[PDB]
Amino acid sequence: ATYHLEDNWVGSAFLSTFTHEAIADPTHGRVNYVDQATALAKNLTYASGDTLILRADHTTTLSPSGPGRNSVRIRSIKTYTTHVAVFDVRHMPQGCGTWPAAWETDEGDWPNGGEVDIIEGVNDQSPNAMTLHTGANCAMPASRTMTGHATNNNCDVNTDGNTGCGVQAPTANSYGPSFNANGGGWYAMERTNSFIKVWFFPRNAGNVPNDIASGPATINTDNWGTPTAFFPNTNCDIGSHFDANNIIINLTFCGDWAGQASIFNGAGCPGSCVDYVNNNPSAFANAYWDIASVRVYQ
């Protein structure tokens, strides 16, 4: 349960240790993922002092036949297996249509190298969801020790419309406008051969483990209390469903999840997701990540 610092990324460090993925959105969102040079020129990525900002374009009214709203998807150059990743996050994207995520996967063999969604939601709908998406023969037990609430317990992407096996965080301030009003917080994910765990601690938590909040070079997860989400190996060989994964942080719009009319309008958002995203640039001023650091331990 003891790990030691492997990477400590702050501010401009992200520009040399991650790349921007200028790809068509795998989730079919109303987005134009720009490359690193484009992001920096357009100030969609800003990386200086103790701050990384990743944001959507909030000035352009989109041509409906042209590409989607400019945004970014950054990916660590390094990959990881058994490790702990800690994200010190001051702000996450908000706004109707938004679908931000901080997560890990192996894109090159998806879903067979696994996927763990650490921070994720849509359309400002708290709470946070933590979810695995895998190949066949990977499920979760109905009862296991965690503070969050399991929804779906089958992780296999070819089941249930690829909901994955998810857990909802117990507090509103785990996600969205609630999280942002509270100044964010910390997300930590420990992955071993035997399990994946995620902890969320709000910015104002009186009980955030010092390991998580201060980022010393040595940590011990035994001292961290019960995880928010727990994915044991009872009904899933975790180690055989996950391989070496990159860390990804992104913001898309609409698409497979956020763009479903029932979900978008269910969230109180007007009209169609694509129309809204095209025509309301100012509504995306607060569609930004503000990240203080990301640390990895091995």
Ligand SMILES: *[C@@H]1O[C@H](CO)[C@@H](O[C@@H]2O[C@H](CO)[C@@H](O[C@@H]3O[C@H](CO[C@H]4O[C@H](CO[C@H]5O[C@H](CO)[C@@H](O)[C@H](O)[C@@H]5O[C@H]5O[C@H](CO)[C@@H](O)[C@H](O)[C@@H]5O)[C@@H](O)[C@H](O[C@H]5O[C@H](CO)[C@@H](O)[C@H](O)[C@@H]5O)[C@@H]4O)[C@@H](O)[C@H](O)[C@@H]3O)[C@H](O)[C@H]2NC(C)=O)[C@H](O)[C@H]1NC(C)=O
């Ligand atoms: C590209 O896009 C970027 C990013 O959006 C644009 O950058 C912004 O530029 C604008 C205009 O120039 C800046 O706006 C001004 O900011 C003034 C204040 O700046 C200083 O304070 C900011 C707030 O700091 C506090 O909060 C944060 C947490 O959010 C703490 O980390 C920090 O320590 C401070 O904590 C104190 O206050 C809180 C309460 O709020 C307490 O709880 C604490 O205990 C503390 O008492 C801060 O964000 C700024 O940091 C930036 O700059 C420093 C270098 O000085 C760097 O180290 C950081 O990494 C970061 O980059 C700064 O210290 C404000 O008074 C004024 O009214 C105005 O709003 C804005 O700060 C920029 N945002 C950044 C840099 O993140 C940029 O303009 C654009 N570029 C182009 C080319 O267009």
Ligand SMILES: OC[C@H]1O[C@@H](OC[C@H]2O[C@@H](O[C@@H]3[C@@H](O)[C@H](O[C@@H]4[C@@H](O)[C@H](O)O[C@H](CO)[C@H]4O)O[C@H](CO)[C@H]3O)[C@H](O)[C@@H](O)[C@@H]2O)[C@H](O)[C@@H](O)[C@@H]1O
């Ligand atoms: O549990 C919270 C929340 O999860 C939502 O799902 C999130 C994931 O949504 C994914 O897209 C899916 C699509 O994959 C799915 O289409 C399937 C096809 O991909 C596949 O080829 O064929 C089958 C039919 O055999 C399709 O079902 O369609 C659903 C919508 O019906 C999409 O949501 C994203 O790719 C993935 O990144 C997300 O994790 C649920 O949609 C939501 O209901 C639930 O509340």
Ligand SMILES: OC[C@H]1O[C@@H](O[C@@H]2[C@@H](O)[C@H](O[C@@H]3[C@@H](O)[C@H](O)O[C@H](CO)[C@H]3O)O[C@H](CO)[C@H]2O)[C@H](O)[C@@H](O)[C@@H]1O
């Ligand atoms: O063409 C066949 C089929 O494609 C479908 O879409 C999926 C994508 O949803 C999927 O997206 C993955 C993400 O959900 C996950 O979060 O990240 C990974 C890594 O970036 C993505 O690959 O990608 C797969 C494989 O390319 C696609 O098949 C449509 O949903 C489906 O309707 C269509 O028939």
